[PDB]
Each structure stands twice: as structure tokens, then as C-alpha cells.
A paper describes a structure:
To verify the uncommon peptide presentation features of bat [name] I, we determined the crystal structures of [name] in complex with the two HeV-derived peptides, [name] (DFANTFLP) and HeV2 (DYINTNVLP), two EBOV-derived peptides, EBOV-NP1 (DFQESADSFL) and EBOV-NP2 (DFQESADSFLL), one H17N10-derived peptide, H17N10-NP (DFEKEGYSL), and one MERS-CoV-derived peptide, MERS-CoV-S3 (DFTCSQISP). The all-atoms superimposition of [name]/[name] onto the other five structures demonstrates a similar overall conformation, with root mean square deviations (RMSDs) of 0.344–0.517 Å. The superimposition of [name]/[name] onto human [name] I HLA-A2 and mouse [name] I H-2Kd generated RMSDs of 1.198 and 1.119 Å, respectively. The most distinct differences between [name] and the [name] I from other vertebrates are located in the N terminus of the PBG, with an extension of the α1-helix in [name]. Although having different lengths, the 8-mer peptide [name], 9-mers HeV2 and H17N10-NP, 10-mer EBOV-NP1, and 11-mer EBOV-NP2 in the PBG of [name] all display an M-shaped conformation, with P2 and PΩ residues as the primary anchors and the P5 or P6 residue as the secondary middle anchors. The P1 Asp of all of the peptides adopts a rigid conformation upward to the α1-helix of the heavy chain. Detailed analysis indicated that Asp59, Arg65, and the P1-Asp of the peptides in all six structures of [name] form a triangular network of hydrogen bonds. Substitution of Ala at P1 (HeV2-D1A), P2 (HeV2-Y2A), and P9 (HeV2-P9A) of peptide HeV2 led to nearly no refolding for [name], whereas Ala at P1 ([name]-D1A), P2 ([name]-F2A), and P8 ([name]-P8A) of peptide [name] still supported refolding but with significantly lower stability than the original peptide. In contrast, substitution of Ala at P5 of [name] ([name]-T5A) and at P6 of HeV2 ([name]-N6A) led to similar yield of refolded heterotrimers, indicating a similar stability compared with the original peptides.
Major histocompatibility complex ([name]) class I molecules ([name] I) present antigen peptides to the surface of antigen presenting cells (APCs) to active T cells through interaction with T-cell receptors (TCRs), which play pivotal roles in antiviral defense. In this study, we screened bat [name] I [name]–binding peptides from different bat-borne viruses (HeV, EBOV, MERS-CoV, and H17N10) and determined the structures of bat [name] class I complexed with these viral peptides. The overall structures of [name] display the common characteristics of classical [name] I molecules in other mammals, with the extracellular region of the heavy chain folding into three different domains. The α1 and α2 domains construct a typical PBG that contains two α1-helices and eight β-sheets, and the α3 domain and β2m display typical immunoglobulin (Ig) domains and underpin the peptide binding domain.
Residue numbers in the entry:
A (entry chain C): 1 to 8
B (entry chain B): 1 to 98
C (entry chain A): 2 to 277
The structure:
């Protein structure tokens, strides 16, 4: 699975 | 400040004529990601397929562009790359032994 | 050891449409996944054979990763405007966010390193530290991101994925993809010969169809290593999922037999020594 993506 | 693509043109398998093969144009080490890559038959454009964009440890992108091709005992194959680091497109010819 | 790595690229396209988001996954040197946000209804898609079976092995795999990538593409289209403001840049130019994350696993499915790293316009921006408890910001603009991520406790969610989930999926891909991923294909090696002048000749040492990408090609003269003297091209994909490399020396004519090419690759029994 993809990891979660965090907002810069 | 852009990073200039390095360009290798080659054949997947050691080339003998009469054998339909795969021509590879591998262009790597470049930045920003927007780029144009084609393979050309005797100067005239071909139809190819292009890898999914990825990048190396230094953040530079690399692409592979490839198509079925049949060598001739004399005929001319080249790859044209355009990128913002280049004042105009570069064309690199596929030769026998590299 | 073995590694599961994902590579995200996102970039703004002023004057042409929305930003673009591309994701690719890799186990070691084999790509198994893509996502491109420029397709109508973009889906995560299999790029390697064993991934055409994940639909029956994990019936929710494609839907939840598609969903995840689509949210990722939305998050980064905003991230591009956030970071651009950090640097006080106008909307006129295109700019690029890249992310690299994943895990290195040794025998017994144990984690060696996790990593999550981001770049802006090709330069280090922010990176998860080796302890996966903390972030390193490369410059002042990136400290905006650091404080947000620290306050929000994002390193712990990253560690959660990297320690648990990244490892579990590396194992599943390794096992389900045993035939592709666990192979070591020796190179097929030969030496060609091009003269240029009468006092000098080019000897090119070839390596074809090998996997993984790791390889060393060394030219020696009478046992003394010619590395500083030779020409090594960067290892290149053959387009079938393996790689090619060559090394070349320019040698005095007539002395060809005093130069040997040493080839090391992980599925050769012993390092090979070749002559013309």
C-alpha cells in the first residue's frame, strides 16, 4: 500500500 | 537551474539484421520533469512507448522510451530529446557497437 | 536485503490545466505500480505480473490505493501553492515536489531503515530522521512544514506505516513475486574490439540482461586496476526488466592479451575474468 501523504 | 539530460541510445539485444528488435532511448539525470522524447526512423518520427516517470537518489528524473524496430544493414535511427536545459532539441544516433 | 520504495512527483503547470501527480512503486529494481493523475478517473495500475493477482488476494487493494493516490494528488496540488508561498514565488513558473519513502528489510522480515524524504525544485526540502521520531528541514521555508508536522504528530503515523505496513507489503510482494523479484540473473558478457589509431585500440567489455542493477565492471592491466583510465557508462535498462552496462579501455595495439575485464554480480558464482 501507499503510505499516507502529509500536507507541506 | 536545470539539470541536463544524459542520453543513451541502444538496442535491447545485440543487433543482427533481419531481426526485429527493440530500440531504447534512455534519458536520465535531468530536472525539471517536463521533457519530450521521441525515436526517429531515418529522420522521420516513430511511435513508441514511454516508461512511468521516476527519479534517482539525487532527485534527477529518468525515462526510457522504446519501440519495436527492425535494423537494416544500412539505415539510420536517432532519438530527439527536448528539455529546458537545452537551447534546442538534441538528436543522438543509434550506432552499431556504441 | 530487500526494499520497497515509492516515488512521487507533482508539478504545477501554469497556463495549462491543473498540477500533475505521478506515483511509481518499486520492490528493489522492479517497478510494480503506477498512478498518473492525468487520466480520466485515474486508477492505481499494475506494472508487474504478480500484481495482476492482487485483486483476488486482496480484494480491496486497488480501491484503497487508488483512493489514497487521488487524495495524495489533491494534497500536493495544495502543497505546491503552500510551498511556493513559503519562498514568496509568483504563480508564473512551474515548480516540482518530489517524495521518496519506503523501507529496507533484511532476512526474517525485519526493518533496517525507514525513510520519508521530500524535495522542492530538485533540492532537499524535508526529511524524516533515521529514528523516525523527528524531521530535518533543509532551509527556513521548510521549517514551516516541520512545525506543522511536529505539532500534528505525523512522524508517528509515518513510523507506523514504515515499521508495520511497509514491511508487511514488502514480504507479500517478495513472496507473490518470488519468480521475478527473488531472481539473480548473471550478465551475459563479451568483449568487442575497435581500433582508432595504430598505437591505440578500444576494448569494450559488455554486460547484458542482468538483475539486480548492482554490478561492478573493472579493467586491469597486469593485475593493476585501470578504473581511473576507463570509460564506464551508467547502467541502463534493457526494457525487459533487466539491465546493461559496458566498460571500455583504449589499449596499445598488439598488447590486448595483457588486459582483463573483471565482472562482479550477485548471481555469478565467482567474479568473472575475460579477455579478447
Amino acid at each position: 500500500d501507499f503510505a499516507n501523504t502529509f500536507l507541506p | 537551474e536545470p539539470r541536463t539530460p544524459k542520453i543513451q541510445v541502444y538496442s535491447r539485444h545485440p543487433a543482427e539484421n533481419g531481426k526485429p528488435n527493440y530500440l531504447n532511448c534512455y534519458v536520465y539525470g535531468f530536472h525539471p520533469p517536463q521533457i519530450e522524447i521521441d525515436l526517429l526512423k531515418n529522420g522521420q518520427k516513430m511511435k513508441t512507448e514511454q516508461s512511468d516517470l521516476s527519479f534517482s537518489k539525487d532527485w534527477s528524473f529518468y525515462l526510457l522510451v522504446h519501440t519495436d524496430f527492425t535494423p537494416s544493414t544500412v539505415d539510420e535511427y536517432s532519438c530527439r530529446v527536448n528539455h529546458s536545459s537545452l537551447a534546442a532539441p538534441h538528436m543522438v544516433k543509434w550506432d552499431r557497437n556504441n | 536485503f530487500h526494499s520497497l520504495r515509492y516515488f512521487y512527483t507533482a508539478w504545477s503547470r501554469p497556463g495549462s490545466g491543473e498540477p500533475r501527480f505521478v506515483a511509481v512503486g518499486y520492490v528493489d529494481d522492479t517497478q510494480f505500480v503506477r498512478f498518473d493523475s492525468d487520466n480520466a478517473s485515474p486508477r492505481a495500475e499494475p506494472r508487474a505480473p504478480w500484481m495482476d493477482l492482487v485483486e483476488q488476494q486482496d480484494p480491496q487493494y486497488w480501491d484503497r490505493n487508488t483512493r489514497n493516490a487521488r487524495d495524495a494528488a489533491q494534497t500536493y496540488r495544495v502543497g505546491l501553492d503552500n510551498v511556493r508561498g513559503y519562498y514568496n514565488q509568483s504563480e508564473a513558473g512551474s515548480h516540482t515536489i518530489q517524495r521518496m519513502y519506503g523501507c529496507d528489510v533484511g532476512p526474517h522480515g525485519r526493518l533496517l531503515r525507514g525513510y520519508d524524504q521530500l524535495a522542492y525544485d530538485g533540492a532537499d526540502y524535508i526529511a524524516l530522521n533515521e529514528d523516525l521520531r523527528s524531521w530535518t528541514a533543509a532551509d527556513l521555508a521548510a521549517q514551516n512544514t516541520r512545525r506543522k508536522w511536529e505539532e500534528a504528530g505525523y512522524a508517528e503515523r509515518d513510523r507506523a506505516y514504515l515499521e508495520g505496513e511497509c514491511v508487511e507489503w514488502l514480504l507479500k510482494h517478495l513472496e507473490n513475486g518470488r519468480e521475478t523479484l527473488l531472481r539473480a540473473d548473471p550478465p551475459k558478457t563479451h568483449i568487442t574490439h575497435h581500433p582508432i589509431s595504430d598505437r591505440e585500440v578500444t576494448l569494450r567489455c559488455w554486460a547484458l540482461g542482468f538483475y539486480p542493477e548492482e554490478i561492478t565492471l573493472t579493467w586491469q592491466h597486469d593485475g593493476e586496476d585501470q578504473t581511473q583510465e576507463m570509460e564506464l557508462v551508467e547502467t541502463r535498462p534493457d526494457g525487459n526488466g533487466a539491465f546493461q552496462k559496458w566498460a571500455a579501455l583504449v589499449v596499445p595495439s598488439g598488447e590486448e592479451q595483457r588486459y582483463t575485464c573483471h565482472v562482479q554480480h550477485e548471481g555469478l558464482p565467482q567474479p568473472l575474468t575475460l579477455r579478447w
